[PDB]
């Protein structure tokens, strides 16, 4: 099992995008996904002010700058991987479709409709 | 005679003859939302009271005589004081703290009755 | 005891004592429309079931014993299996294909009864 970094594509896809402190970061995760089988790791990041959200074209936003220095601490709770595919498999970071980030929290829930009427045989008569 | 809530200052037994008077009074898109919310709520409030009468076995009635005994701890008064001196507004305050107990008992006695009536058929 | 749908995994005769538990749980303008539609639908669904009980002669009841015979072709089981082994979810699947037949028969027998009762007055 090998891990490899992302394939090409736009910045929003090939990097780890997130919003923290009010600014939009695009970090290079090739330092995390570079191994066969299994101090600190420093990931360099780029920052943008002009943001095209989701996959839409036509509605851009400008992110006002934030004064002072930004520091964020967060939990990585999971990964989105895509398999590149005969004795080995390569996994690469994937993403870009936001539904995958909600599917991971809503996986336990189901919506059902209640149907309160029913009939059954009984031994009685009006 | 009197119109809506006209009997509000009357005694409980003088009132309770006017039950249909009150029962019949219960029935720019943003402006439109406000009006629809008001109408939908009036319907939902109406239906909740009707559902509750239904589970107590009082559906379709304005006066429903039940099979739950009165506990003197809820209000130790004789019929003369309750029906001839007090008004419904005063009464509602007097037994406010026992309303949920009474409602629970009414539901239970109906469930027992409803099953007994099935066994007899 | 149990709350809403707590009896869902219980047998049919263990359940059906909890009928009031489930019955009571049936009750930016664009955001407002979504919420009003949800509320209006809950009311419409409620009323359709109530209308249907009404035309079958079961208004106001949670358990209504009717005058339509059970056809063994709908489900050839004894009371012991239906009420002591099966759950309501299993039963609903078993006779799904006969629901509309049964409903039609219930309407017809009420129409006959309702007229007989007029002729006797």
């Amino acid at each position: 099992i090998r891990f490899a970094n992302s394939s090409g594509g736009d910045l929003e896809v090939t990097t780890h995008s997130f919003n923290c402190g009010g600014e939009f970061f695009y970090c290079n995760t090739s330092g995390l996904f570079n191994s066969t089988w299994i101090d600190s790791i420093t990931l360099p990041c780029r920052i943008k002010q002009i943001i095209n959200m989701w996959q839409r074209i036509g509605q851009a936003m400008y992110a006002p700058p934030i004064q002072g220095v930004i520091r964020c601490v967060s939990n990585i709770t999971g990964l989105i991987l895509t398999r590149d595919g005969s004795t080995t498999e390569t996994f690469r970071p994937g993403g870009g479709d936001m539904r995958d980030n909600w599917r991971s929290e809503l996986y336990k829930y189901k919506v059902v409709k209640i149907e309160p009427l029913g009939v059954a045989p009984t031994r009685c008569k009006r | 005679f009197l119109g809506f809530l006209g009997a509000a200052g009357s005694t409980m037994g003088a009132a309770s003859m006017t039950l249909t008077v009150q029962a019949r009074n219960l029935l720019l898109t943003v402006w439109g939302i406000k009006q629809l919310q008001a109408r939908v709520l009036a319907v939902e409030r109406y239906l909740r009271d009707q559902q509750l009468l239904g589970i107590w076995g009082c559906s379709g009635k304005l006066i429903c005589c039940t099979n739950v005994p009165w506990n003197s701890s809820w209000s130790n008064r004789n019929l003369s004081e309750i029906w001839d001196n007090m008004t419904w507004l005063q009464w509602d305050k007097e037994i406010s703290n026992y309303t949920q107990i009474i409602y629970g008992l009414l539901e239970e006695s109906q469930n027992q009755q409803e099953k007994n009536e099935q066994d007899l058929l | 005891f149990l709350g809403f749908l707590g009896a869902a995994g219980s047998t049919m005769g263990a359940a059906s004592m909890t009928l009031t538990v489930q019955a009571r749980n049936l009750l930016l303008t664009v955001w407002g429309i979504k919420q009003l539609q949800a509320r209006v639908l809950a009311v419409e669904r409620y009323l359709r079931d109530q209308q249907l009980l009404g035309i079958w002669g079961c208004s106001g009841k949670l358990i209504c014993c009717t005058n339509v015979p059970w056809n063994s072709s709908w489900s050839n089981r004894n009371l012991s299996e239906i009420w002591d082994n099966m759950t309501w979810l299993q039963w609903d699947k078993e006779i799904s294909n006969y629901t509309q037949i049964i409903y039609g028969l219930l309407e017809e027998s009420q129409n006959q009864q309702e007229k007989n009762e007029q002729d006797l007055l």
Partner: antibody
Amino acid sequence: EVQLVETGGGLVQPGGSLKLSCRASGYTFSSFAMSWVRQAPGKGLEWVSLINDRGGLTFYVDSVKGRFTISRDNSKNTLSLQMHSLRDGDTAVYYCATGGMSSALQSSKYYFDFWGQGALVTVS
Amino acid sequence: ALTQPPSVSGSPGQSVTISCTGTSSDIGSYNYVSWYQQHPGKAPKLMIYDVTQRPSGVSDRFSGSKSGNTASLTISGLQADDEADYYCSAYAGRQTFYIFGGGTRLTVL
């Protein structure tokens, strides 16, 4: 194996009162309707009273209808029969029996499945 | 109530029939006619229920049926231990729930 054990006094004066009871075991008490049947000292059987499994419905033979009360306590597995007034005509062996009715969601009985041994009651 | 006051008899191996006669708004219309066996000094035992059915534990020497307003109990391979008073009963509707006939003494010869 089931048991029905009648207990209770066996000798009263007419005009008095008497309580009989029946302790049950070996079956779910609460699943069955129960009844009392008299055996006249020199004749046959007579049905006296019937109670529902839940204890809410009671039925009586006309001759005791205004005098006897049948009751059930499902937490202790017991029946009771409270006699009042008492007549010489009430002398009999009183049997505790399981059966008699039904509960709508189950097969009917309309027969008596189990009998106790019988308490003897004499009215002097 | 129901009737059959005389005794009944036969030798071991001979069958016997015990009658139980009622009326229309009783035994005729309701198919609930059980039979009970009582040895003197002992509690009654259920032998037949409904019309033809027997309890588990009851031998196949005991069977029964009804016609019109008359019911009967049949005992086939009669044994010495069948000497008991047999009673019939019936469900007679609501209000009058149960009635019994007098018992009949079965004598094995």
